[PDB]
Short mmCIF file of C-alpha atoms in Angstrom, two decimals:
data_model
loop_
_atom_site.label_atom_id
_atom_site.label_comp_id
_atom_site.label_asym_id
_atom_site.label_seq_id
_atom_site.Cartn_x
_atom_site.Cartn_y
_atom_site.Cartn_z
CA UNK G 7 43.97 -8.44 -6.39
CA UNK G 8 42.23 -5.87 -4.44
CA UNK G 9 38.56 -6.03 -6.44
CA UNK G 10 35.72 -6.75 -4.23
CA UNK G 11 33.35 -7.40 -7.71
CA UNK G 12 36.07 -8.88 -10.34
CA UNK G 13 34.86 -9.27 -13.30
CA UNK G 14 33.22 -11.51 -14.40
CA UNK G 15 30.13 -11.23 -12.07
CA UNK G 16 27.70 -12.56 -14.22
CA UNK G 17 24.39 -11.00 -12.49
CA UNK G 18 21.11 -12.37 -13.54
CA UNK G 19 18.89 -9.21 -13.41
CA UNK G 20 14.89 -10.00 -12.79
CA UNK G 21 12.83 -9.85 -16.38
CA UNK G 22 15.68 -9.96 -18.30
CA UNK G 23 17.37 -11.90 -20.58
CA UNK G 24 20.67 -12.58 -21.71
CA UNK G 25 22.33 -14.39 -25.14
CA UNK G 26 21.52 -17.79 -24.28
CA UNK G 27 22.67 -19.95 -27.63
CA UNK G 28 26.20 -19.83 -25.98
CA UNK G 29 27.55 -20.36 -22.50
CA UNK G 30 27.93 -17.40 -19.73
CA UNK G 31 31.47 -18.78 -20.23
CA UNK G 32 31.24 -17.60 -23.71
CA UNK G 33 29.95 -14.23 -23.24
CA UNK G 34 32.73 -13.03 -20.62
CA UNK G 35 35.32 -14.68 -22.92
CA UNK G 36 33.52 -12.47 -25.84
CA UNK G 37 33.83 -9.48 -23.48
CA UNK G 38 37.33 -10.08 -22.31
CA UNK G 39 38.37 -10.56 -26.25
CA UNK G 40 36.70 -7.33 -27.12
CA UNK G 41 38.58 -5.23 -24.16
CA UNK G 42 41.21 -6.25 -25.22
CA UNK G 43 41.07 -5.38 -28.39
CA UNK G 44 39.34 -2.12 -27.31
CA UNK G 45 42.16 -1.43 -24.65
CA UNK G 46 44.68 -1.08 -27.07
CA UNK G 47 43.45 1.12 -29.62
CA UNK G 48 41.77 3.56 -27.50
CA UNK G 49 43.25 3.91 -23.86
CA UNK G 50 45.99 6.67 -23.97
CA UNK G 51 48.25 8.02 -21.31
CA UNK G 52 50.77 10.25 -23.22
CA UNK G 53 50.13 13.42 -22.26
CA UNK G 54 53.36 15.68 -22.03
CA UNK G 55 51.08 18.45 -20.50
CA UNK G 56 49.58 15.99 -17.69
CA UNK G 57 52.26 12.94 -16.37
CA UNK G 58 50.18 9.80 -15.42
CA UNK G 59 46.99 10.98 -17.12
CA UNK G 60 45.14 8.59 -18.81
CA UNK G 61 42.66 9.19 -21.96
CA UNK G 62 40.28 7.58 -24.34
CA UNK G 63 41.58 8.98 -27.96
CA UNK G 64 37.96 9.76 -29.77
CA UNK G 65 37.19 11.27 -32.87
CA UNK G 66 37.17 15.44 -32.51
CA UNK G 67 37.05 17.22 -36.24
CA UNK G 68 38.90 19.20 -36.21
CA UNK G 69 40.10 22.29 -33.69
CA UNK G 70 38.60 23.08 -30.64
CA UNK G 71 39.38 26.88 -29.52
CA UNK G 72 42.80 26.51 -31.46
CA UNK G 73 43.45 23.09 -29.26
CA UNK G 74 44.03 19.73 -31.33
CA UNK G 75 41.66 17.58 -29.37
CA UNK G 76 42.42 14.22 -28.85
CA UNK G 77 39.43 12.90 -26.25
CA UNK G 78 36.22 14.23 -25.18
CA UNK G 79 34.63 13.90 -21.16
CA UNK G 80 31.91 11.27 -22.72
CA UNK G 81 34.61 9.19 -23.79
CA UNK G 82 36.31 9.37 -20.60
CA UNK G 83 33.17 8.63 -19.02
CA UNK G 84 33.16 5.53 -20.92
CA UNK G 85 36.74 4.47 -20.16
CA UNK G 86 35.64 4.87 -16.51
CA UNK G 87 32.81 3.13 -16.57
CA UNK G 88 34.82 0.06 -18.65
CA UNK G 89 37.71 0.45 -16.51
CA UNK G 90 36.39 -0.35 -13.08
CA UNK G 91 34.36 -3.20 -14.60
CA UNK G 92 37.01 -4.84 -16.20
CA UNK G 93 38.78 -4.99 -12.81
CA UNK G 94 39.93 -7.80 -11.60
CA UNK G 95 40.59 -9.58 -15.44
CA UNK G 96 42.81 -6.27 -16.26
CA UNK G 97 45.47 -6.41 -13.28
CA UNK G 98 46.26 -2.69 -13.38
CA UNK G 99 42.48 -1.48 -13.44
CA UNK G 100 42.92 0.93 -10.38
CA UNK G 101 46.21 2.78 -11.75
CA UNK G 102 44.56 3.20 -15.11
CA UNK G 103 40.89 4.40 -13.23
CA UNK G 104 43.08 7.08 -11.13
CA UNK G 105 44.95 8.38 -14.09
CA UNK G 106 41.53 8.74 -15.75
CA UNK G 107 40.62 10.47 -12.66
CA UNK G 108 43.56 12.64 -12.66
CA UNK G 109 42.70 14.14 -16.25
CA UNK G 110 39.00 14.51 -15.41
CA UNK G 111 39.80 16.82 -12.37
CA UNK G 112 42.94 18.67 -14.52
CA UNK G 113 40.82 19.09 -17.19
CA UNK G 114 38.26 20.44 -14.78
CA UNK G 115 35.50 22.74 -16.30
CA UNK G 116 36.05 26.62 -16.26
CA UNK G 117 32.40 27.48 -15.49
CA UNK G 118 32.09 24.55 -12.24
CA UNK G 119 35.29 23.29 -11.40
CA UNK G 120 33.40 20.19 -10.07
CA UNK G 121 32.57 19.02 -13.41
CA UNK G 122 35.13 17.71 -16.53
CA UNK G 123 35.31 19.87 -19.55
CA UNK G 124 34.51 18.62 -22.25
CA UNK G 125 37.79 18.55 -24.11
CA UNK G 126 41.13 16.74 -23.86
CA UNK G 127 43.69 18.60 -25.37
CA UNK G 128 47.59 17.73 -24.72
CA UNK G 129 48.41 21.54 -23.98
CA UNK G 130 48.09 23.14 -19.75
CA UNK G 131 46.60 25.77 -21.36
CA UNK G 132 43.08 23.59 -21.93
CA UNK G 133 43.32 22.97 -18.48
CA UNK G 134 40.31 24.08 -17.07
CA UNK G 135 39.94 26.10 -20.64
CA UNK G 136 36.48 24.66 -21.77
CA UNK G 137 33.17 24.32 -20.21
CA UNK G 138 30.88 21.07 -19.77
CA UNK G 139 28.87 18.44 -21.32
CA UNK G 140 26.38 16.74 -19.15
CA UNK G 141 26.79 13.09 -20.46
CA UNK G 142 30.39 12.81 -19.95
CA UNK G 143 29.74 14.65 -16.02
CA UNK G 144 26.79 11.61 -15.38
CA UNK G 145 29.50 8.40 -16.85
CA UNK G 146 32.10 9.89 -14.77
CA UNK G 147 30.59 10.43 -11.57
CA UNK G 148 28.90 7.29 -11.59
CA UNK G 149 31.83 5.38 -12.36
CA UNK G 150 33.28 6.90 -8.95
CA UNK G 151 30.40 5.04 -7.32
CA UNK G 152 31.52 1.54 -9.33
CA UNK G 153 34.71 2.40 -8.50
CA UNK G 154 34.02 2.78 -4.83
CA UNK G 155 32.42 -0.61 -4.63
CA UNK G 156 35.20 -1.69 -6.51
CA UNK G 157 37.93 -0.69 -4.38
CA UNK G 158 36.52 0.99 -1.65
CA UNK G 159 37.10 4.40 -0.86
CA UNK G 160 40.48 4.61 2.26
CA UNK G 161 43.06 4.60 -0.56
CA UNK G 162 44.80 7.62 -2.00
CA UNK G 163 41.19 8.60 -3.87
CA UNK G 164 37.94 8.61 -1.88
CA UNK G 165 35.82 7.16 -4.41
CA UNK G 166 32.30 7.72 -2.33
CA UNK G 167 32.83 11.29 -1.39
CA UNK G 168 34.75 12.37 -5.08
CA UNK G 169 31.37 10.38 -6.74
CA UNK G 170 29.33 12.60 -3.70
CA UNK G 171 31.17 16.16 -4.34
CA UNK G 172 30.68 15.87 -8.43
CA UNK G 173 26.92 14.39 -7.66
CA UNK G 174 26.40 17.30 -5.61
CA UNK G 175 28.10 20.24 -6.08
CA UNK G 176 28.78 19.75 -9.71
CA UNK G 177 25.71 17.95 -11.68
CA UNK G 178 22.65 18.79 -9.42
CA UNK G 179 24.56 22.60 -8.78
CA UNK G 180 25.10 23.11 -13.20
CA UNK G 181 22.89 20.70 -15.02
CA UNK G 182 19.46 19.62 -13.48
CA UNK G 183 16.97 22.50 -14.36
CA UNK G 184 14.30 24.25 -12.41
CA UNK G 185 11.84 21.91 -14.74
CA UNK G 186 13.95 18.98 -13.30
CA UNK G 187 15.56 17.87 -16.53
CA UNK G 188 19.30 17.90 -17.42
CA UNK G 189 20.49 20.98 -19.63
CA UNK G 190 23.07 20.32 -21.94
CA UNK G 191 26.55 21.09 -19.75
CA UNK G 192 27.80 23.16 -16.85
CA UNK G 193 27.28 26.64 -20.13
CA UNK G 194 23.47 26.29 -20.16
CA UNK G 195 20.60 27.89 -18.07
CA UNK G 196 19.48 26.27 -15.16
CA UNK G 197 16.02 27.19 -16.46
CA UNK G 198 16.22 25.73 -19.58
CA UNK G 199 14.29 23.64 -21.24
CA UNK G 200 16.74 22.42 -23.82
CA UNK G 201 18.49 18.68 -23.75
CA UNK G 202 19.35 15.66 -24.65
CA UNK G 203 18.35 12.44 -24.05
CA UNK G 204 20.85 10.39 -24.21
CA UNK G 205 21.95 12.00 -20.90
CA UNK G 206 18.56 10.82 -19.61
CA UNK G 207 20.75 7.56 -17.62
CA UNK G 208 17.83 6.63 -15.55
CA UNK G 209 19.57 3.93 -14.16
CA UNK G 210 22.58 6.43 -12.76
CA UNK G 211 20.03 8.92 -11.22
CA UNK G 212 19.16 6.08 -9.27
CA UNK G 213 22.53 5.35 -7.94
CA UNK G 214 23.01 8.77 -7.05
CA UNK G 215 19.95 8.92 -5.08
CA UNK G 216 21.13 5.48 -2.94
CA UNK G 217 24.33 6.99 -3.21
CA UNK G 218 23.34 10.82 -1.90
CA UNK G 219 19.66 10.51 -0.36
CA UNK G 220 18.88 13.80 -2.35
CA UNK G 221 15.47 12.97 -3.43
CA UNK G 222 16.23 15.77 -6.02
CA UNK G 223 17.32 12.55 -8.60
CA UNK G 224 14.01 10.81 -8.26
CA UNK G 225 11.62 13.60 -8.80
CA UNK G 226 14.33 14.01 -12.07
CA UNK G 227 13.60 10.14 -12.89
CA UNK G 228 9.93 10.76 -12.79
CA UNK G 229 9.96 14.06 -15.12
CA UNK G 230 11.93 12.49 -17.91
CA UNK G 231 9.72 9.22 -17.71
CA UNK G 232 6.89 11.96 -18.05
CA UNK G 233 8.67 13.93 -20.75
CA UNK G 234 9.41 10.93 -22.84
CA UNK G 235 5.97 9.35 -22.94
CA UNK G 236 4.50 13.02 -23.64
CA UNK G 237 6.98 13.38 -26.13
CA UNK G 238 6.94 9.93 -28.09
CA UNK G 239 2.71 9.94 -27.97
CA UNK G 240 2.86 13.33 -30.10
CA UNK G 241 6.13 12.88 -32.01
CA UNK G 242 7.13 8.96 -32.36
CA UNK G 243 3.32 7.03 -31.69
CA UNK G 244 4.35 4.15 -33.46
CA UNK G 245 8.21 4.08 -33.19
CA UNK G 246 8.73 5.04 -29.58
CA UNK G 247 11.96 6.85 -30.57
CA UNK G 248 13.27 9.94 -29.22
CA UNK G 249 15.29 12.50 -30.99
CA UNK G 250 18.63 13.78 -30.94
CA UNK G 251 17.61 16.55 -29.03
CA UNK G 252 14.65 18.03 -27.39
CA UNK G 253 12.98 21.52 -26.66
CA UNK G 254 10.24 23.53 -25.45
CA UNK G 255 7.15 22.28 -23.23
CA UNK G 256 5.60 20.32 -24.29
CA UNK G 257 8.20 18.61 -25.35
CA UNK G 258 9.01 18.81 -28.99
CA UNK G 259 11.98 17.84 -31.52
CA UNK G 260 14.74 20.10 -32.04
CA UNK G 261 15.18 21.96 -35.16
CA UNK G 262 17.69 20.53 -37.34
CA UNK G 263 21.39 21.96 -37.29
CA UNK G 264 20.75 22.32 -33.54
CA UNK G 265 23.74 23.68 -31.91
CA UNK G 266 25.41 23.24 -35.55
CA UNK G 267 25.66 19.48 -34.83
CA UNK G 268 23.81 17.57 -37.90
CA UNK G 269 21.06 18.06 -39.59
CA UNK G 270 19.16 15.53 -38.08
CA UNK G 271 18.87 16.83 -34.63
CA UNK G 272 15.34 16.64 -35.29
CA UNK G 273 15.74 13.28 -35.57
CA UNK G 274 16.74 9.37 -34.31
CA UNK G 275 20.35 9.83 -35.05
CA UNK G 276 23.97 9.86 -33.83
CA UNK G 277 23.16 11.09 -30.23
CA UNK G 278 19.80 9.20 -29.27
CA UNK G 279 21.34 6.25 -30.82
CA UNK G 280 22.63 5.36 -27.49
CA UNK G 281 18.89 6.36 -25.63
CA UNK G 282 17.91 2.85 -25.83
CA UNK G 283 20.63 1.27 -23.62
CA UNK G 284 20.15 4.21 -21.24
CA UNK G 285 16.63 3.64 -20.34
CA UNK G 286 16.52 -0.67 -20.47
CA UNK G 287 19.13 -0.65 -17.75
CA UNK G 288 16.68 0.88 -14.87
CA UNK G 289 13.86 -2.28 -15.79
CA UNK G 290 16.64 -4.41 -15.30
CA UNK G 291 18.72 -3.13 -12.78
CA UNK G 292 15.88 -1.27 -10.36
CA UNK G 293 12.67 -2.97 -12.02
CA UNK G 294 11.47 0.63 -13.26
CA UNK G 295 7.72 -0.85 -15.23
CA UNK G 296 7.81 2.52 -17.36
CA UNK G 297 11.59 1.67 -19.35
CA UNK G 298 10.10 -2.03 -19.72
CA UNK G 299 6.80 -0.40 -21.49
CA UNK G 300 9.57 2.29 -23.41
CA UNK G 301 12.08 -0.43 -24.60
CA UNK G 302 9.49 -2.70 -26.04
CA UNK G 303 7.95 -0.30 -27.60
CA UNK G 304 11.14 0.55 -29.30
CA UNK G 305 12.35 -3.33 -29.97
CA UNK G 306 8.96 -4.09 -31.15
CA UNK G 307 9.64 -1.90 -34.01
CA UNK G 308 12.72 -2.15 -35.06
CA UNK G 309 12.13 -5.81 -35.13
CA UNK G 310 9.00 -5.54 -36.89
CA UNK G 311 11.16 -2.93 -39.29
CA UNK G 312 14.50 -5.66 -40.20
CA UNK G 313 12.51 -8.54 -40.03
CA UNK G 314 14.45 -9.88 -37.62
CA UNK G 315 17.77 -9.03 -39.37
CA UNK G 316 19.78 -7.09 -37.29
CA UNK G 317 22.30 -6.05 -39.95
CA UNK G 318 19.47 -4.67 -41.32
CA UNK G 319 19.50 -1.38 -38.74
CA UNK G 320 20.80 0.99 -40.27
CA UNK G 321 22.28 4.36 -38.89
CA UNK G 322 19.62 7.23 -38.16
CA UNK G 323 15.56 7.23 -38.29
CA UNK G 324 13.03 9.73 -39.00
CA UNK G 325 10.42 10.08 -35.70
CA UNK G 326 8.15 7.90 -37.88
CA UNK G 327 10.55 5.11 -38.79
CA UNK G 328 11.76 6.23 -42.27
CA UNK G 329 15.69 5.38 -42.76
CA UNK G 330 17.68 8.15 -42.67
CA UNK G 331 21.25 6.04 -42.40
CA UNK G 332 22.61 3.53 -44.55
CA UNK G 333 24.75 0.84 -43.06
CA UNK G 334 24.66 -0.53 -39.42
CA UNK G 335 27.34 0.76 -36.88
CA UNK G 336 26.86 -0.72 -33.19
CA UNK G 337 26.16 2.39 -31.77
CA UNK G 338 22.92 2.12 -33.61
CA UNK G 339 22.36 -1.97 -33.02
CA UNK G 340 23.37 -2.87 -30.02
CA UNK G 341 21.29 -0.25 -27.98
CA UNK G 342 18.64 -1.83 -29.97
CA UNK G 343 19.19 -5.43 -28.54
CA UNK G 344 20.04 -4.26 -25.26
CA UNK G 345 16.52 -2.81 -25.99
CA UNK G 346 14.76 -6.32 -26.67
CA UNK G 347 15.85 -8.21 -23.12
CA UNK G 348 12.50 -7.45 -21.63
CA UNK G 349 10.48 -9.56 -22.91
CA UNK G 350 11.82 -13.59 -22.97
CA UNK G 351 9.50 -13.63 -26.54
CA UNK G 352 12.48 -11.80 -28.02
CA UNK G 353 15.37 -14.56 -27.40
CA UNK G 354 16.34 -15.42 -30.92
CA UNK G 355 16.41 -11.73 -31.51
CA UNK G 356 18.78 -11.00 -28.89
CA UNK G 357 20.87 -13.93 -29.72
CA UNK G 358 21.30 -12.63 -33.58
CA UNK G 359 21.99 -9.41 -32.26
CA UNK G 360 24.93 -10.52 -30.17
CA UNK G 361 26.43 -12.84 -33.00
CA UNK G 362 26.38 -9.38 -34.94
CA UNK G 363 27.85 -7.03 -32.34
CA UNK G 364 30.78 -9.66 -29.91
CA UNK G 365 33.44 -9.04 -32.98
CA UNK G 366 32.38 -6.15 -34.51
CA UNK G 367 35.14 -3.78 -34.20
CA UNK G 368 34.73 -0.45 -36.58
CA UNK G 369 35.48 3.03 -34.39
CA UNK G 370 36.13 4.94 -31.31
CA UNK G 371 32.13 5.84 -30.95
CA UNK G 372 30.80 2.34 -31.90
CA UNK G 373 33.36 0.39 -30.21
CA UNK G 374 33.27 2.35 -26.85
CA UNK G 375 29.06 2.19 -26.48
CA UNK G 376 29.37 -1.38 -27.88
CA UNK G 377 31.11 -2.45 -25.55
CA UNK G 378 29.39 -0.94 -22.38
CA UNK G 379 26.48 -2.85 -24.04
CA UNK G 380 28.39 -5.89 -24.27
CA UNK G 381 29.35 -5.55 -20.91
CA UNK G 382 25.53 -4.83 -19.83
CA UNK G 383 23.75 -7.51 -21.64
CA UNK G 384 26.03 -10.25 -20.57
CA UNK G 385 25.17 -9.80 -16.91
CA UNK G 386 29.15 -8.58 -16.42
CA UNK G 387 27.88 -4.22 -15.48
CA UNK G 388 26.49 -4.90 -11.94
CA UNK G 389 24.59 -2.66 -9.57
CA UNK G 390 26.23 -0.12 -7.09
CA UNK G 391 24.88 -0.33 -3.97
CA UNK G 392 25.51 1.00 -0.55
CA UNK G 393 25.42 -1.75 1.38
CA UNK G 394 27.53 -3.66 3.16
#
């Protein structure tokens, strides 16, 4: 035992509120339960193409440049992220976080080899075959930092100046635009104005400005802050939601069948899903007043919207509220609670929507995100910091 934060570490963040019709005891036994469970469905290390690689199997349809893929760089962004913060309950954290490492930096990208691409395929030939996506890039490389923290960085990987390198040379050099956004991966312009917004993890650009001193990640923090308000006053007044993707300046909702992905890129759907959790984290963890003023915006009305039921969310939104979806997947409802834990008026809330999401176990997608909100709401994802 090697951790220097084992889980659990239980932080109480300022303004925020956790579950609290249950012991702290009871949420980290509800987390540990639900790695478990997560753990063995989903973490992979049999790669014949890559010995000691470790992957999170996800849910590609169906081939990817002839490759049969089998994982994607958000998902092992996620399995980073979970990894490291499970350390010091799972006993073999730091093999499994290296072999993770060791398949994000085979499967480098071809356009910058600093960056992951965004497929795992079990063949050498998608080595290095396929370009980037930002969002897997931003979990991974701030997982480094965790893992750093975690470990510290004289062993056989240095954490701090891996986390540094991809920070630096890979997502500042490939994804953040000359209108200081993020682009879509490592293919896009570095002019353009396209993206997505679940990429927009305020709370990461933070740690890689403690983590880098490049003030280039604040003045990135404060244009998406800007972008979102200017977009959700025009497009989402009384919502506060975001689509799946965004374009032009001002900013403005995709057109649907965007990059061929769903028809609703236009809309709250599969991808912006996971926006909520993304922005609530930098209230909590660095006090940012503008996510505070976005998230309860956002809880308000989905709140307002179930009437309090939580398994009444269901699984996409028009910009105005309308339901698009049909059933609720916790990709779609926990974001939403992790939304609520702003405001202390929203405690009964928050305490239905962890009694729906400790056990619910459906998916790679669901599971993966619910779990990083698990982790986040109970206090047990704590703050990178370089201190000492």
């Amino acid at each position: 035992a090697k951790e220097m934060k084992p889980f659990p570490q239980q932080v109480n963040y300022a303004g925020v509120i956790k579950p609290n019709h249950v012991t702290q005891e009871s949420l980290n036994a509800s987390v540990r339960s639900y790695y478990d469970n997560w753990k063995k469905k989903y973490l992979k290390n049999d790669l014949s193409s890559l010995p000691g690689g470790y992957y999170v199997k996800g849910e590609i349809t169906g081939d990817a440049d002839g490759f049969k893929p089998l994982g994607t760089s958000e998902g092992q962004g996620y399995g980073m992220i979970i990894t490291v913060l499970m350390a010091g309950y799972d006993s073999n954290a730091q093999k499994i976080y290296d072999g993770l490492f060791k398949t994000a930096r085979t499967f480098k990208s071809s356009q910058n080899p600093n960056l992951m691409g965004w497929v795992v395929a079990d063949s050498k030939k998608a080595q290095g075959h396929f370009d980037s996506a930002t969002d897997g890039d931003l979990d991974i490389a701030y997982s480094l930092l965790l893992a750093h923290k975690q470990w510290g960085s004289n062993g056989t990987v240095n954490y701090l100046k891996e986390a540094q390198d991809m920070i630096t040379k890979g997502i500042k050099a490939s994804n953040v635009t000359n209108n200081n956004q993020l682009n879509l991966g490592d293919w896009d312009s570095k002019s353009s104005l396209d993206t997505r917004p679940s990429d927009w993890m305020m709370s990461h650009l933070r740690a890689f400005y403690e983590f880098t001193g490049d003030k280039t990640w604040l003045t990135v923090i404060n244009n998406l802050y800007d972008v979102y308000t200017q977009f959700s006053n025009k497009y989402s007044p009384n919502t506060g939601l975001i689509s799946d993707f965004v374009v032009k300046n001002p900013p403005q909702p995709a057109p649907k069948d965007f990059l061929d992905e769903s028809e609703y890129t236009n809309a709250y759907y599969y991808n912006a899903s996971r926006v909520p959790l993304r922005i609530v984290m930098d209230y909590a963890m660095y006090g940012e007043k503008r996510s505070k003023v976005i998230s309860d915006k956002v809880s308000s009305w989905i709140q307002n919207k179930t009437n309090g039921n939580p398994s009444k969310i269901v699984d996409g939104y028009q910009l105005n509220g309308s339901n698009i979806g049909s059933y609720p997947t916790a990709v779609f409802v926990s974001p939403f609670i992790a939304a609520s834990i702003t405001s202390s008026n929203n405690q009964k809330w928050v305490n239905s929507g962890w009694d729906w999401m400790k056990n619910k176990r459906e998916r790679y997608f669901s599971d993966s995100y619910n779990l990083l909100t698990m982790l986040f709401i109970t206090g047990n994802w704590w703050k990178p910091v370089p201190d000492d």
